[PDB]
Structures are given as C-alpha cells and as structure tokens.
Amino acid sequence: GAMDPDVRCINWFESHGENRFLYLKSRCRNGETVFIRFPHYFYYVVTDEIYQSLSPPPFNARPLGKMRTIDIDETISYNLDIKDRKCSVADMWLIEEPKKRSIQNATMDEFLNISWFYISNGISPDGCYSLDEQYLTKINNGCYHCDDPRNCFAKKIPRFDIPRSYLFLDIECHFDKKFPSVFINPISHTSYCYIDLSGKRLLFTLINEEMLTEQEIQEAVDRGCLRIQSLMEMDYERELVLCSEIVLLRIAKQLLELTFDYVVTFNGHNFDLRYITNRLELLTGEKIIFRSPDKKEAVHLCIYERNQSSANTTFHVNNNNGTIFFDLYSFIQKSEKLDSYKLDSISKNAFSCMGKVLNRGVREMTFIGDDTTDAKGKAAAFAKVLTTGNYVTVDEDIICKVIRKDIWENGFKVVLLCPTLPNDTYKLSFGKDDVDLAQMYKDYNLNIALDMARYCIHDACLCQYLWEYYGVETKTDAGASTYVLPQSMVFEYRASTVIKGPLLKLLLETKTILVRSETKQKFPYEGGKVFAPKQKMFSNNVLIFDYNSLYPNVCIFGNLSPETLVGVVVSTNRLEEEINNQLLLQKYPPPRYITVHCEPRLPNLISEIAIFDRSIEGTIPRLLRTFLAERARYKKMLKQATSSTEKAIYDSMQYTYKIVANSVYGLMGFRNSALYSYASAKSCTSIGRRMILYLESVLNGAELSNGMLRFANPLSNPFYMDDRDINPIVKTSLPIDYRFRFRSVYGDTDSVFTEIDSQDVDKSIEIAKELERLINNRVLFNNFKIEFEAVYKNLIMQSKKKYTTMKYSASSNSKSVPERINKGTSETRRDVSKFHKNMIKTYKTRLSEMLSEGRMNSNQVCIDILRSLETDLRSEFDSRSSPLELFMLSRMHHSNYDNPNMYLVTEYNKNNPETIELGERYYFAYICPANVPWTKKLVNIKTYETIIDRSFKLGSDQRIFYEVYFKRLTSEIVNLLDNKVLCISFFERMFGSKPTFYE
Ligand SMILES: [Mn+2]
Ligand SMILES: [Mn+2]
Ligand SMILES: [Mn+2]
Ligand SMILES: [Mn+2]
Hints:
Bound molecules: manganese (II) ion
Radius of gyration: 33 Å
Strand order of the largest sheet: 36-35-34-37-38-30-39-40-41
GO biological process, one term: DNA replication
GO molecular function, one term: nucleotide binding
Family: Belongs to the DNA polymerase type-B family.
Distance between the termini: 70 Å
Helix content: 25-40%
Organism: Vaccinia virus (strain Copenhagen) (VACV)
Catalytic activity: DNA(n) + a 2'-deoxyribonucleoside 5'-triphosphate = DNA(n+1) + diphosphate
C-alpha cells in the first residue's frame, strides 16, 4: 500500500523522445525501489536586458542576482601599454524552456542542463530525502511523477545504508584462426554471477549443447548437469545448464532486460554484449529491449562510442531504464596507470597473499595463508577469489592448477600442481584460469566444455572481485556528489566535462561569468620534459621528498587564472626585454603582482612574461582551494569513522577530491575546456619547475656538521624579495657528532631525491625528518610544503618508470622488512639464464663496492669494470668450464596466437621418442657447431635454439653459442654504467652492433 517516503538516490537517467523527461531511481530503507519522473527543461542564462526582450516569454525564470561578466581572451603585449580587461555587471536570469531555443547572446552556454537541474532544485545526486508525498502523483506501480522537485525534495536527511542488486557476466565464443565473428562463430558459454539484495550470490553458467555429441550431452546430464529445451525450463539454482544456443541467447535477453542496479563486465560493452545482441538478431529475429520506468519509451540495445584525443575510445549501452551497465576495462584505463590492462595482469596485482608451506614432494606443494602470514585480511581477500579461481601463481612465475581448497572467513589452505623448491614462505598470485582456448575449441569434448565453464564463471566473478577491490560503488556516488552528475554519467563523461558542475557552483557563489569572445589560437604547453638521474647505481641511501600537490599549490601561490592575468609581455631583442622588465617591475610590483617567465610562444621572441594580480582571488585558485579543503575534511572523517562501510564512503570522497584537483593542470592547457588559459598553464609549469630547481640548489652540496645544516645556497624566494631569513646556515636538533653531506641526484615535476653519504637507514630517517622540518620552516614559504616519503637503499634507477630499490618508509625503522620495489622490467625464470643472473649479481656487487671507495671519474669505474668483463668473457669462451645448465632457458608450449617455436617443437616431436605435449614447460639453449669462431654478425638466432631434453648430450662437435648470452649480459651491464661513449665503443668492438639504452 503506502510508499516509504525515505529514499536514497542511486541513479538518474533521461528519455530522449519528442516527449522527454528526467528519471530518478531511488531505494527505500526496506529495499523497495521508487522511480520518480520529472519534466525535462533546457536552461539558459541571460542578462536582464535580453530577458525583457524575449519573443514569446520563457516558460519560467528565476533571477540570479548581479553578476560580473569578464573578457578572458589572452593577448600579448610588446610593451607595457596594457589595456584593462573588459568587465560588465548586470542582473542575470536562469530561464527554463521545454523546447531548445537560440538566444542571440545567452551566456554560461558551456554548462550542462543536468547540472542546472540539481543546482536549481537544491538536490544532491546521491542524497537521501523524506519525500513530500503531496508533490508526487502515481502513474504506474512503483513510478511517480513530480512537477515540483524543489518542494518534493525539500527535506534532506542523513545517509542510510541500502542493499543493491548486481549481475556480473562473461561469455566465451568459439574460434580457430581468426578473431570470433558473429556471422559464423557460435557462443559456447555464458556465465552469470548474481548478487541479490540479501547478499546471496548465485552462480550459473549456460553451456551450448550444439557443440557437443549427443552421447556427451547425456554424459553431462548423468554427471550432474541440467539439460533444458526452452527458456521456460531454466532453473537458476543450477550452476551448470546445457541448452541450445537460441535458448542461451533468449536467457541473456531476459536477464539483460531486468532492472538490476549494476550490470558489470570486463570489456563487455565492446565485445560480450555486442556479440550476444548481434547473434540474437541473427538466429531469431529478436532485439534486446529496455523501457523507461513508466513504459513510455522503449529502445533497442545499441552500443555507442565516446571519443577523446589528448587517445582512446570507450563503449556504452543506451538503456533508458536506470540500470548502470558498467565496463571495468574502460574504468580501469581511465583511473589507473598500469603496464598491462589485460585481466590476468590486473588480477595478479590486485589479489596476492603470502603462503606458508605445510607439505612438499610428489608433484604437489601445499600452502596456507591467514592473518599470521601477510597482513590483516589480505588472506581473507585471496580466499574470496579462491572460491571460483582454479589456477594460482606461485612466486611471480609458476602457474599451477588447484587440486583442493579449504576456505574460511579469514584464511585458506590450498594445494597446487607445481614443482618444489620449498622455503618456509612464498607469494601467491591470482587472476584468470590461464589456457590455450584456440586449442580447447579445436579438440572440444565434454571435459573441455566443463573446463571452459569453470574458466568463464571465474572471469565473471573476477568482475565482482575487482569491483570490490577498486571500490567502484562508492567512487560512483562520490563522483556523482562532487561532479554534480548522475552516477551513470560519472565514469562515462570525460574530465573536461566532470569539472563543470563544481565550477558552475563556484561561478554562482562568486557571482562571476567568464566569456571568451574569440577563437582560441592553437598551441597547448606540449614540451615533453622527461628527467634523467645523475647516476644509475647508488652505494649510498637516497632520501625521497615529495612536494604536496605542487600544481594546485602553484596556482594558489601565483593566483593563476585566466581573469587574474593582467597581460603577457613579450620581447624580440634584449633592449625591449630590458626596457619592458624595468617598467614591469615599476608598474606591477610584488607582492600584489607576480611576474612569471614562460617559454615564449613564437620562435622569434626571446622573453615572455605573464603578470598576475593576486589581490582578488581568481576562479581557478579558489576552485582548487575548495578541493583541497574538502579532501582534508574527508581524510579526517575517514580516520574518525570506524564502521568499514563508512571508511569506504569517506575514502572515496577523499580520492575523488584528489583526482579532480589533479585534473586542473591539464585542463588549463586543453583548448576545448572551461579552465583553458595558455598563460596560466604555462606560468604554472614554470613556477613549479622553479620550485624544483630552488630546492635542488639549496640541498645539492648541503652539509650537516655540528648542530648545523649548511644549505648550499641562500634561502632566497626565487620570484621576489621576501621577509624571511635567507641565512643558509641553520640550527638543527640532530646530534653534534653527526657529519653528513647531501647531493641532489634526481628531480622531476613534483619530487626530489637526495643522496646522503651514509648507509645507516635509522640515521638516514632521523636526518630526513629534520630536513623535512627545516625545508618547510626555512627553505619554503606560503603554501609550499614537502613530505619525506621514504629512504631508498640500493637504488638502481634508469628513470622514474624503470627503477629497482629496497624502500624503508617514514614509519619504518632500521630493522623492519623493506618493500622490494621493481618497476618496468621483463625477465626472471628462463627469460634470462643462470649464467646471466650470476654474472649480473657479481658485477653489481663489484660495482657498488667500487662507488664506496669514492675514487672514480665516471670513467675510472667504467674502464675498470669493462676490462673485467672482457677478461671474464674471453675466459669463459676459452676455458668453457661452465656447465650447460647455466645456459638453459624455458618456455611454455602452446598453439599460435610465436610462429618458429611450433616448428621447433613439431620437429623435436617428429624426430625424438619423447613428445613435448601442448601445455608442457620445455628447456632450450643457444647451441652452434664447434667450428664457428667468435661471431659478430648475427642471424635469426631462432636457428640456434635447441631443445634440451633428458637424453641430450652436447656434441663433441658443438659449442654453447656464448655470444648470444654475452651480448645480452653486457647490454644489461652498460645500462648500469654512466659513461655512454666508452660503452658503445666496447659493444661495437666485441659484438659488431650498437647497444640498447633504456631511455
Ligand atoms: Mn570476457
Ligand atoms: Mn572470458
Ligand atoms: Mn606526499
Ligand atoms: Mn601424446
């Protein structure tokens, strides 16, 4: 009977007919769901003078107050004759119109209608409300209409928790050589993971009958599977069902038309759903049909795309029913920087745990994980994935099937089909079930269909595991709140669009409108500035300091905004440059104005100087100031809340404010954007770069002796003269006996790395904490602060992208387990051989000791270690004492997509008693005839790849083709060195080739 008036908004969505509306989907405290319909309007902002003129009057209008409208067009000046920026004030009107309308000079045109709805009616997209039933009339069951949302939604109330419904799905399609085409290839499996409002999980997979033998189908039935002849006969409590492809497809249609809250896939929008839909249209006549919650609009499922050059394309479903069809692949690309976006990689990273060993031998290891073994509930997370996972990865390398599993709420005991090297502990990774599908389909029988079924249900459940892991639900709500957007639009729309809501709110609060009355000239701030460490290998510890949100703070410091730009003053020669500078300093003095040297915009200009008035806070800095404040709030709320549901909400809010803040720098240089300002963007780049150089200049050559830190330069504010004590000799609270010396070793857009002549990590942390304090209190100024993140022992670094170190964090002490940090790399188990590993490990240990002598050029180390390499290499090529075991490499056999490796294994099988079967792990080496001398040409090495089995003995008339292994080894060694010209000389002489340098 009676509707519950207490609702929590969870999505908003539009119909698009000639007769169009806005719809809300909300959830009551009980679990009932209320859809509410609102009439659509198109909003326009006009001046009072325009309002009064309007041909027929607008449907409705609310005044906005007086508002300053400002010309933000950017102009360069060749002298200091800079005209004031055009500014007018007028009473403004927000007008509502049911049909689109062209208004000759309407302002605020960039902002979205949906944003105006929320702002105007005073409605938060994710809020909870006690609806005033007085303003709702019913129209279907469950669906009401609201002509007056302002009054209906007048009583906002605190957040209550709600349950939600999910369908996670994945499908498998047949193929042999080409990528599956809908016209010829059938769907073989469809797997579903349904989460009910109760929390109950339902797993079911439909297998396509038509790809099995009548005898096999009956075997499946005999074994436990349900066979069905139509949609009508489907029992959803059966985990395995056999049916025709047409039935399977009809079942998909029925599920996809249901009003789940979320339908979640990994690349389902471009593949899985597209395929189901087209295949259905082919085999029967049928479409998949979504309907608005009042049944007024129906649409056929049609996947559409959205484009965004900086770059990628994303795919979206057009359902008008309130369901959020959400693709994890698209999302994980937008919101994470990763080397792989394959699902096995993303899962490997997300789901790992530490495994203590209980049994050994046979071909079966056994592990346990729990709170004792890794962290609190890291094993709980792993154990949830194990419910459906069938292959675990041991120690980054060993893929190996599960044989049995015991799962409880906090830990897992798992037994695995692998080799044996049993230490007390090992790392366990998850992800897919790895297979060769192409072969599975070629040989397809019942036991393979069931295998694929288990593989497929897991890829679906990975979507629910990753959805929990990335906190998508709460991020969606936080997004919707902060961006002033429907939940469904939060990760669909691009960054230039999501910033517009909070910008609009700011412009309204500051009674300001920004108008670009001109075509923007073309140029962004592209430059491609990438940063090279002073040396690669570090004997000493390295201290890591991060600026705090540098670019947000730079904009705040300089008050960088299109409308606070007084002007830009350019010069083509030094006379103009000097005259202009001396006039600049007279007419626009600090501290009210800041003047910023930028890279000049034209090639004939020798200087470009942007001048900003700091007296009246600019739009952009204030936007950022809000975002940092809001983030700060939520970080506190995060620590004061204790319910893990609440922790998640506040953690998301906090994240959302980080992201939107960091979007701003980019948006200032993106031409199609509401925050575009070439000068501001360039000035921001430039001020930040200067802050890096200032910090570096002060620390590079700095020493701590007695109680005093002797900064290497005076602590002068780099932009203008300052109240602060520039004295670089500074009292510290460290021990008098301490004597240390600092070197600026690397620095980038926001981070600075400082070598200290010391290996004692406990002291290094003591000192770095003091450095932090003095940098923040004496070196820096205004809103510029650094954190001391960590100490880096045994840094070996090529760039910020490729580096390896042990990391003692700021919490850390001398004797807690570091964090091994590897980045960018490609090797381990048979990618590289034991000869190589042993040689790299020695040449590192010899080289780190060489840097602790202090006696070196770049060259005296470089000459010394390359003499050593020749001597060891020529020695092994002569003596040949090293076993073949040291030169063996491994590889998995599999079918094509690789091509010469099938020829390698085929011919081995075709010529030898043993067979290397199609998922076996086989060994090989680079072997050549003994009568080949030191070779500096090269061929396709693939000819000297030689399968080494148990009965292989090295010919009396063969040798290990040492050159292959040597060339690879000295490549890795010269990339540790610093003298480049000496290394290239060596490598052309020894190998007749020019080396790689990871740049
Ligand atoms: Mn898939
Ligand atoms: Mn799959
Ligand atoms: Mn930090
Ligand atoms: Mn066989």
